[PDB]
UniProtKB/Swiss-Prot annotation:
Name by which UniProt lists this protein: Thaumatin I
Cysteine-cysteine disulfides: 9-204, 56-66, 71-77, 121-193, 126-177, 134-145, 149-158, 159-164
Subcellular location: Cytoplasmic vesicle
Function according to Swiss-Prot or TrEMBL: Taste-modifying protein; intensely sweet-tasting. It is 100000 times sweeter than sucrose on a molar basis.
Keyword line: Cytoplasmic vesicle, Disulfide bond, Signal, Taste-modifying protein
InterPro entries on file: Osmotin/thaumatin-like_sf (IPR037176), Thaumatin (IPR001938), Thaumatin_CS (IPR017949)
Lineage: superkingdom: Eukaryota
Annotated Gene Ontology cellular component terms: cytoplasmic vesicle
Keyword Disulfide bond: yes
Length: 207
């Protein structure tokens, strides 16, 4: 499947794509403002994620650092990035269907629209100014709005027991973005699409 990743932000981002133990396609690339990068993701990919990284510096071998979503200092991500990261999440060809969502469980850095380019389902979006409105105690000095699990490392915020409820912090993410996961056990906002759909991830979609 094809994922067109489009940076509509006014600033450069470094897109990343991984399923956690491996890159998807090249795994990462610079996207200047307005650039589109089209990747191929293998059918059957389970637990795949795409995200933006901000304020990155890489050497001529692809090694360096980002202020948000750094994946072990690599241009080409092989693993998930360091929070805060708004997450486009997807599992493909899972018994005949694809499942997509956006998640704020690992915080928020960049606004995002995650939509099929082919027929038969809707897109998901979290494009409110979460950074600007972020609760003081969640603000990341590196940039972005952290999730409460990352900041406080409790069983309640991290849902470590599989028993956890919504929180003051999760409610903030949910108020700003109803259509994304605000905590691990949030009422699912996952969208069922046809198996083998194609997609576009658009960073800063509101323009």
């Amino acid at each position: 499947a094809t994922f067109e990743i489009v940076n509509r932000c006014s600033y450069t981002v470094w897109a990343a794509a991984s399923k956690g133990d491996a890159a998807l396609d090249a795994g990462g690339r610079q996207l200047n403002s307005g650039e589109s990068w089209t990747i191929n993701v293998e059918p059957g990919t389970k637990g795949g994620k795409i995200w933006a990284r901000t304020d990155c510096y890489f050497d001529d071998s692809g090694s360096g650092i980002c202020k948000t979503g750094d994946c072990g200092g690599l241009l080409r991500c092989k693993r998930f990035g360091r929070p805060p990261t708004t997450l486009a999440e997807f599992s493909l060809n899972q018994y005949g269907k694809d499942y997509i969502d956006i998640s704020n469980i690992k915080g928020f850095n960049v606004p995002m629209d995650f939509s099929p380019t082919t027929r038969g389902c809707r897109g998901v979006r979290c494009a409110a100014d979460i950074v600007g409105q972020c609760p003081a105690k969640l603000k990341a000095p590196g940039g972005g709005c952290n999730d409460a699990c990352t900041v406080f490392q409790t069983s309640e915020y991290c849902c470590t027991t599989g028993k956890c409820g919504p929180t003051e912090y999760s409610r903030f993410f949910k108020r700003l973005c109803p259509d994304a996961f605000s905590y691990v056990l949030d009422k699912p906002t996952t969208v069922t699409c046809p198996g083998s759909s194609n997609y576009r991830v658009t960073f800063c979609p509101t323009a």
